[PDB]
């Protein structure tokens, strides 16, 4: 499948799929306590890369919370918040037109 132009806003060139930045541990502090076994960094990266790698397969099309809580197990509210973080930073849904 021919890949199209990855396009995020410049204040987010810091995002890297294979690591967790500082801004993410401050914005989404529920996966970074060490007290909830179901919410760690390893699962954070899954939830987060699936949403991001999904939206990039076709960036002209809104990726949604429903298609994320269908595919991945975890608190839907936690996934609502992850979805909105990534929307703020334009890492999700930046081009939906």
């Amino acid at each position: 499948p021919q890949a199209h132009e990855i396009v995020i806003p410049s204040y987010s060139k810091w995002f890297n799929l294979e690591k967790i930045h500082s801004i993410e541990v401050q914005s989404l502090p529920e996966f970074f306590t060490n007290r909830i076994p179901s919410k760690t960094p390893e699962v954070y990266m899954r939830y987060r890369n699936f949403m991001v790698n999904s939206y990039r397969l076709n960036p002209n099309e809104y990726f949604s919370v429903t298609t994320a809580r269908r595919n991945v197990s975890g608190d839907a509210a936690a996934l609502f918040r992850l979805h909105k973080f990534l929307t703020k930073w334009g890492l999700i849904n930046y081009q939906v037109d």
Binding site: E30, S38, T66, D75
Partner: protein
């Protein structure tokens, strides 16, 4: 001090001298609107006075037993909750539209906002506006159920393992990293379906009480 009581009013024509199906959110801290004045405005359809009395006594009964969010009650304030996820089942009919759905919801994280979720649901599925209140009532009504069972079991809402073997068994299992991706068997039921439906199918459903 949020205490929206999820009210469910249901009275049949057989054992109740009248029929009525309704749901609402009653804010228990607002003591200044009379229940009786609200019910008499609800049912502009008519022994009227004695039927208002039995409805109010139902609303009152539910306000007087409502178990407000125990976390915002017995101080904890643990960010991100103790991972007590519930299964929130939806089966909502609004006119001809019926929504079936299932999603996990954490009952021990007081920053989960049902109205914020219900309102993006109705944006993404583009549901008719009426679904927003109904999805929110159903989140709050199913969450309360578990908040009121744990209560009558003396659970301390602090984070310990759930004693009761049943209540513990309805609680979703812990999410290791091999569990993040849903099996095909679960992603079937954990997703929304919006059917159109007729008066005739509606009859089949209601006749399933």
């Amino acid at each position: 001090s949020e205490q929206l009581v999820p009210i469910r009013l249901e009275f049949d024509q057989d054992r109740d001298r009248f029929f009525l199906r309704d749901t609402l959110l009653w804010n228990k801290n607002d003591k200044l609107i009379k229940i009786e004045d609200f019910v008499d405005d609800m049912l502009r359809d008519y022994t009227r006075e004695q039927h208002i009395d039995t409805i109010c006594q139902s609303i009152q009964e539910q306000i007087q037993e409502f178990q407000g969010n125990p976390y915002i009650e017995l101080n904890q304030d643990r960010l991100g909750g103790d991972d007590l996820r519930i299964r929130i089942k939806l089966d909502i009919v609004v006119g001809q539209n019926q929504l079936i759905d299932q999603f996990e919801w954490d009952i021990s994280n007081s920053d989960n906002c049902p109205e914020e979720f219900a309102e993006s649901m109705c944006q993404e599925l583009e549901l008719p506006g009426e679904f927003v209140t109904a999805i929110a009532h159903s989140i709050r009504e199913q969450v309360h159920m578990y908040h009121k069972s744990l209560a009558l079991l003396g659970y301390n809402f602090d984070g310990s393992a759930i004693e009761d073997d049943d209540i513990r068994s309805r609680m979703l299992p812990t999410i290791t990293l091999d569990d993040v991706y849903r099996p095909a068997a679960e992603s079937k039921i954990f997703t929304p379906n919006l059917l159109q439906i007729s008066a005739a199918e509606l009859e089949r459903l209601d006749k399933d009480k």
